[PDB]
Amino acid sequence: SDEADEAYSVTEQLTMTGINRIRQKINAHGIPVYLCEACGNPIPEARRKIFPGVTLCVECQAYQERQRKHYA
């Protein structure tokens, strides 16, 4: 198995696992909520044109990402 084919299986498991773990965080189909779920701000219509199912607004999600940057 030449020691660089098991490397190939490990690397393809790495890429596929990471890319599936990202694509599960795209929340493709959802409901049109029109209001953010931590602020009640009107989420603009171009943003729902981008992502169907954004329960968070742009900058409250930005705050969520900045809080999740470290952990906890």
């Binding site: 030449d2 020691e3 660089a4 084919d5 490397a7 190939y8 953010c36 931590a38 602020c39 009640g40 701000n41 607004c57 900058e59 409250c60 705050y63 900045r66 809080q67 940057k69 470290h70 952990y71 906890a72």
Partner: protein, 1337 residues
């Protein structure tokens, strides 16, 4: 235009990008680094002088003595490289140091001295790096590697949440100095900063601020932002500071700005700065959770209501309005942006002023003791602010002031109060998301310790080991006539330095297989050893490849297996910094133009700029051509415009090392198959006729020359004489250095033995009268063809299954490959015999030995030694040595047998040296080394007068040829100014000392030049005594031995089923069959395939570059079979110069422009002679041959442009359908032969301690039948097979000789019993007080 050597065979070169930097001297790291060690630096900062200026002057007790340093000198070596490799002694130079001891008197500590003591003491011998960057240590060639250790400085790391199960990552900050205390910060799981000084217990990290005399309001002044409240109930607003969900809405001007509930948005803070708000009125509940920022009392009585660091109450707020207070300050703690950490670590901190702050620090350092007010404070202030405990070096402050983004690139060697809080402000910012963490594997944190820096540190530790003697010798007695020689032993500094080069894991054997194996070995950067990590604590941490490896270390070339990523390989243009970091050249981009001033950037300064790629198209003016240029800043690589970029790569070769810059079409291989191909190229064995790569990278010439195995012309000139062992170059008048003799002799290295027991041999490629330049190759080393790296052979390959004989990975090999001897390799083994001194007598080296019956003994000379030239076989006696013994207690049935024939006991035994099993070779050297007390024998003297007639002749041949250059150099003078021309060759040449000239400088030069011939005759008189000294002198042998006779075989191994051929692309396999030449596939030309390969290895292991090389091998041997066919008919040069110029000018816009119109006619047929095999193709690494340029080059031949021809079966003659790829892959022969791996043993020697069979192929060993082979035997029912593999075949001493008698009896029944591993186990438990015994049935 080309060199004259380069006109012999021009490698046709694709690779359209132009070359800005030459590939530099690859061995600059070793040679330039040991330059810095053994060199007198007058401002002593580098190497040995820096070590001496560190340790000297030496004070005694109370300063009544002083040992002071004047200078040092390296002596001349007692032996050269060749003599040290022969006798086996370190190629070292005697280090003698000029010293000076000054004595002092009463009332004159440095005033009136009493006595000086000037002497030159010998303190140890240090090993010298020879001309190829290597060392000779015990005769063996060692290479001292560089180390990738972690730098001093300040390191911000994280814990990645793996510390706690709560999830929270805990950022921490270590400040590592050169020597001193590892001041470390970290976060609590609940956001509280801590300190510990030498990995001791934690203290809350305001303690280190209080011990630096910072109070609480000063600490909050440092680490926070201050919005101020006032009255009624107004808070002045910073317009940006509100970002966090609207708690209270706004109360400014009364009307509206935005209301409660929702988020503070980018809309709102825009509207508050346009409507120009500065102050807001806030409720009393808004100031409930805020924390007071300075002290506050009541100003009637001065009574403390609320000092800082305290949770503000609302009754407490109205306490200040009734105190008349206007200003109320507070701390800005947004939970996302500027979190409260310095506040809440004061909320835990039990200490409040510096006297009790040093208490906690002294009780963290030294517990138990009562901290006195001076004893605690004098410990702390000396810990980070004193030069004799806290040393931060030049590179330590360089990494410090660059990490916190200062520009104070040099400074103190200690910390300061602002230097420490700059760490805590950065670690807070890392917790607050301002900037990123640092990485373990950044190449801005991992510095390089090299040879000259590691031998210095083994000389400074030895200069403290001798310092303890002379500090205490100089303060005992204080005698005069006391010299600086009787104090300074040569032992503790020689044992500190011949430990390092001798046995330290960064002082490894030099892999000497081919010139790539050594040139990769000196440019190796291993992260192991002292100072760096070992394989234990390595991770998963530093085995990865980090984006700061670009240009500095090869991402591809690391050894796979146990330490992958732990040992690296230095990249091609990679250079070391002044400070020790790896810096790589980038050409400066101006406004829009790539300039030419190359700048070397270490990985700290790479992430600051915007660096383009070398595969970006460039105009004739230096301009970028397309607007969006693919570049790469800090970690990403996005599209930047052509103005904003700062730097460009020099060439596309600059990401790889020199091992991986030789893999053609490395773009098309995977990163691991290139990692696998770069590994196997350094294990290639040099073949008989060295053979160029048809598909090279163009690097092959540079690696061949820069590895020292070639013989490179130091000056130009014409060859006065060529020989198989020497080349004499008559230097031109241009570069002759007018006090010289005229010619220099290149003494070639003949069939000498490598480290890896291969053959090193130089073949002079030049001919007689052929003009050479400086630099040009005259003799190729092992594995070099015409100054080009030649690691294997060009093999007419095919890609098809062929009957399972190349099934999994295997290789089917023609009989023509074996017949043409393309993979036959010489292997020079040394085989020694030692006459030691046993107790009942010494061992003789006679030829008259016991019972072995004078057939093998006719190969022996008079003195029991074989003749040079003898063709031995296995078990043949090389050196006859006999050893005395007793009569050895002859058994019954020997007392009857030796009374019948009457032949006595031989009384001596026959411990002689014989050839080991299987090897058949030719004896090519015998060297006899004798102790001085032992006289000699006949062979030891016959080698001696042969040596002495050789060592006296070559100095005469030095002299008679240096004269024969001088008597033409002096003849050049006698043409002008007092000319003796016709009477020159008539007057005898000894009276050219007496020849008359017009008395100019020329006749004074004639009385200089011929007077230097008088120096040539006395230097010959002096050097002939020197090789009369060492040749005749007795050996300084190891004590106990008399005669070491070192026979030197030479095997000439040939390829067989079992040897491991490989490609350069990670395509390795094992020859499974030597198929006969009529059974190989052929095309319709009758040309058989030399090697059939399995194509199934190609789609999965995605190295497509072996298919592209194979198609470029078909094109290269396509050109060569028309240049051969034209010379076959003796075609005129109008046919040749119009085909070869067409062949040398193909493909899109290649940088190589070779014009054969300006070529001499005897150079073209010389160029066509070296192309009649095939035109070599340079495919530069990420630059070379596109797929269309192969097919166009294939169409210059009349070969099919798909690469595949229609092959017919060799045996049955009907074709394979669906045509087959053929071409010329460069197949290697790896150093895994079946002659060195086959091993078998019936019954050999056993081990003494436990009675198991010995270990290893050399010790005639057995196979280890471990745990996993026993469970897989219990998984069958093989009970009897496993009982004999632990009783009979391993250790039971009775049961194993009752088996060998039973097999010779013809009875396969064991009577096994109980093993000898278990009685040894039984006595070792019963050697404790444990009565473990065997019961009875």
């Amino acid at each position: 235009v080309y060199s004259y050597t380069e006109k012999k065979r021009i490698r046709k070169d694709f690779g359209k990008r132009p070359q800005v930097l030459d590939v530099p001297y690859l061995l600059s790291i070793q040679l330039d680094s040991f330059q810095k060690f053994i060199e007198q630096d007058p401002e002593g900062q580098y190497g040995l002088e820096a070590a001496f200026r560190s340790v000297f002057p030496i004070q005694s007790y109370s300063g009544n003595s002083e040992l002071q340093y004047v200078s040092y000198r390296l002596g001349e070596p007692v032996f050269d490289v060749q003599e040290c490799q022969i006798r086996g002694v370190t190629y070292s130079a005697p280090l003698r140091v000029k010293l000076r001891l000054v004595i002092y008197e009463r009332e004159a500590p440095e005033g009136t001295v009493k006595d000086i003591k000037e002497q030159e003491v010998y303190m140890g011998e240090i090993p010298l790096m020879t001309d190829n960057g290597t060392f000779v240590i015990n005769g063996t060639e060692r290479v001292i590697v560089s180390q990738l250790h972690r730098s001093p400085g300040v390191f911000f790391d994280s814990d990645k949440g793996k510390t706690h199960s709560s999830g929270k990552v805990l950022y921490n900050a270590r400040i590592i100095p050169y020597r001193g205390s590892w001041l470390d910060f970290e976060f609590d799981p609940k956001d509280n900063l801590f300190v510990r000084i030498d990995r001791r217990r934690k203290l809350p990290a305001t303690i280190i601020l209080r011990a630096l005399n910072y109070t609480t309001e000063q600490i909050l002044d440092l680490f926070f932002e201050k919005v101020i409240f006032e009255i009624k109930l107004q808070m002045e607003l910073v317009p940006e500071r509100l970002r966090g969900t609207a708690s209270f809405d706004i109360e400014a001007n009364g009307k509206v700005y935005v209301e409660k509930g929702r988020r503070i948005t980018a809309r709102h803070i825009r509207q508050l700065e346009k409507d120009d708000v500065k102050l807001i009125e806030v409720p009393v509940e808004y100031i409930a959770g805020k924390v007071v920022a300075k002290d506050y009392i009541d100003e009637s009585t001065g009574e403390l209501i609320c000092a800082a660091n305290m949770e503000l109450s609302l009754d407490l707020l109205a306490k200040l309005s009734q105190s008349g207070h206007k200003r109320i300050e507070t701390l800005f703690t947004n939970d996302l942006d500027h979190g409260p950490y310095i506040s809440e670590t004061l909320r835990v901190d039990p200490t409040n002023d510096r006297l009790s702050a040093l208490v906690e620090i002294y009780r963290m350092m030294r517990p138990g003791e009562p901290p006195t007010r001076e004893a605690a404070e004098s410990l702390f202030e000396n810990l980070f602010f004193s030069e004799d405990r806290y040393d931060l070096s030049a590179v330590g402050r360089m990494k410090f002031n660059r990490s916190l983004l200062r520009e104070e690139i040099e400074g103190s060697g200690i910390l300061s109060k602002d230097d420490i809080i700059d760490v805590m402000k950065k670690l807070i910012d890392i917790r607050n998301g301002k900037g990123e963490v640092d990485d373990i594997d950044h190449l801005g944190n991992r510095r390089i310790r090299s040879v000259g820096e590691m031998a210095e540190n083994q000389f400074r530790v030895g200069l403290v080991r001798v310092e303890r003697a002379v500090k205490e010798r100089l303060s005992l007695g204080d005698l005069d006539t006391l010299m600086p020689q009787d104090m300074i032993n040569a032992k503790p500094i020689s044992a500190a330095v011949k430990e390092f080069f001798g046995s330290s894991q960064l002082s490894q054997f030099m892999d000497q297989n081919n010139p790539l194996s050594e040139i990769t070995h000196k440019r190796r950067i291993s992260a192991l050893g002292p100072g760096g990590l070992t394989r234990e604590r390595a991770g998963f941490e530093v085995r990865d490849v980090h984006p700061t490896h670009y240009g500095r270390v090869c991402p591809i070339e690391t050894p796979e297996g146990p330490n992958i990523g732990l040992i690296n390989s230095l990249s091609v243009y990679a250079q070391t910094n002044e400070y020790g970091f790896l810096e790589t050249p980038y050409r400066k981009v101006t406004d829009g133009v790539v300039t030419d001033e190359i700048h070397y950037l270490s990985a700290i300064e790479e992430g600051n700029y915007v660096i383009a790629q070398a595969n970006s198209n460039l105009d004739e003016e230096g301009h970028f051509v397309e607007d969006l240029v693919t570049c790469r800043s800090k970690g990403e690589s996005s599209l930047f415009s052509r103005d904003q970029v700062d730097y460009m790569d020099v060439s596309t070769q600059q990401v790889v090392s020199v091992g991986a810059s030789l893999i053609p079409f490395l773009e098309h291989d995977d990163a691991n198959r290139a990692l696998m191909g770069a590994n196997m190229q350094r294990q290639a064995v040099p073949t008989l006729r060295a053979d160029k790569p048809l598909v090279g990278t163009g690097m092959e010439r540079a690696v061949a020359v820069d590895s020292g195995v070639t013989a490179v012309a130091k000056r130009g000139g014409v060859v006065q004489y060529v020989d198989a062992s020497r080349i004499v170059i008559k230097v031109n008048e241009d570069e002759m250095y007018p006090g010289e003799a005229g010619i220099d002799i290149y003494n070639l290295t003949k069939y000498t033995r490598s480290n890896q027991n291969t053959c090193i041999n130089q073949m002079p490629c030049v001919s007689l009268g052929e003009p050479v330049e400086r630099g040009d190759v005259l003799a190729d080393g092992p594995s070099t063809d015409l100054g080009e790296l030649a690691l294997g052979q060009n093999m007419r390959v095919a890609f098809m299954p062929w009957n399972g004989y190349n099934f999994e990975d295997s290789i089917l090999v023609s009989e023509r490959v074996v017949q043409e001897d393309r993979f036959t390799t010489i292997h020079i083994q040394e085989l020694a015999c030692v006459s030691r001194d046993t107790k009942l007598g010494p061992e003789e080296i006679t030829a008259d030995i016991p019972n072995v019956g004078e057939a093998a003994l006719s190969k022996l000379d008079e003195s029991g030694i074989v003749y040079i030239g003898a063709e031995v076989t296995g078990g043949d006696i090389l050196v006859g040595k006999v050893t005395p013994k007793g009569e050895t207690q002859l058994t019954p049935e020997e007392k009857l047998l030796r009374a019948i024939f009457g032949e006595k006991a031989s009384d001596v035994k026959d411990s002689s040296l014989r050839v080991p099993n299987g090897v058949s070779g030719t004896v090519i050297d015998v060297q006899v080394f004798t102790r001085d007390g032992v006289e000699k024998d006949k062979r030891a003297l016959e080698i001696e007068e042969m040596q002495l007639k050789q060592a006296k002749k070559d100095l005469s041949e030095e002299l008679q040829i240096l004269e024969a250059g001088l008597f033409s150099r002096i003849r050049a003078v006698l043409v002008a100014g007092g000319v003796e021309a016709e009477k020159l060759d008539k007057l005898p040449r000894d009276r050219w000392l007496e020849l008359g000239l017009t008395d100019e400088e020329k006749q004074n030069q004639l009385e200089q030049l011929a007077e230097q011939y008088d120096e040539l005759k006395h230097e010959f008189e002096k050097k002939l005594e020197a090789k009369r000294r060492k040749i005749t002198q007795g050996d300084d042998l190891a004590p106990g031995v008399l005669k070491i006779v070192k026979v030197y075989l030479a095997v000439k191994r040939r390829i067989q089923p079992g040897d491991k051929m490989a490609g350069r692309h990670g395509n390795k396999g094992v020859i499974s069959k030597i198929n006969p030449i009529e059974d190989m596939p052929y095309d319709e030309n009758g040309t058989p395939v030399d090697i059939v390969l399995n194509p199934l290895g190609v789609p999965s292991r995605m190295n497509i570059g072996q298919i592209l090389e194979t198609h470029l091998g078909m094109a290269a041997k396509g050109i060569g079979d028309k240049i051969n066919a034209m010379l076959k008919q003796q075609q005129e040069v109008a046919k040749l110069r119009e085909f070869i110029q067409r062949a040398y000018d193909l493909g899109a816009d290649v940088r190589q422009k070779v014009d054969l119109s300006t070529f001499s006619d005897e150079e073209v047929m010389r160029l066509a002679e070296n192309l009649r095999k095939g035109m070599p193709i340079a495919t530069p690494v990420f630059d070379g041959a596109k797929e269309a340029e192969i097919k166009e080059l294939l169409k210059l031949g009349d070969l099919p442009t798909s690469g595949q021809i229609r092959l017919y079966d060799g045996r049955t003659g009907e074709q394979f359908e669906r045509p087959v790829t053929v071409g010329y892959m460069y197949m290697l022969k790896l150093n895994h032969l079946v002659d060195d791996k086959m091993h078998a043993r019936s019954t050999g020697s056993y081990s003494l301690v436990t009675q198991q069979p010995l270990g290893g192929k050399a010790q005639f060993g057995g196979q280890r039948f471990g745990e996993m082979e026993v469970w897989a035997l219990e998984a069958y029912g093989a009970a009897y097979t496993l009982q004999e593999m632990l009783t009979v075949k391993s250790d039971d001493v009775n049961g194993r000789t009752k088996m060998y008698k039973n097999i010779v009896d013809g009875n396969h029944q064991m009577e096994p019993g109980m093993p000898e591993s278990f009685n040894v186990l039984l006595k070792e438990i019963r050697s404790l007080g444990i009565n473990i015994e065997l019961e009875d049935e």
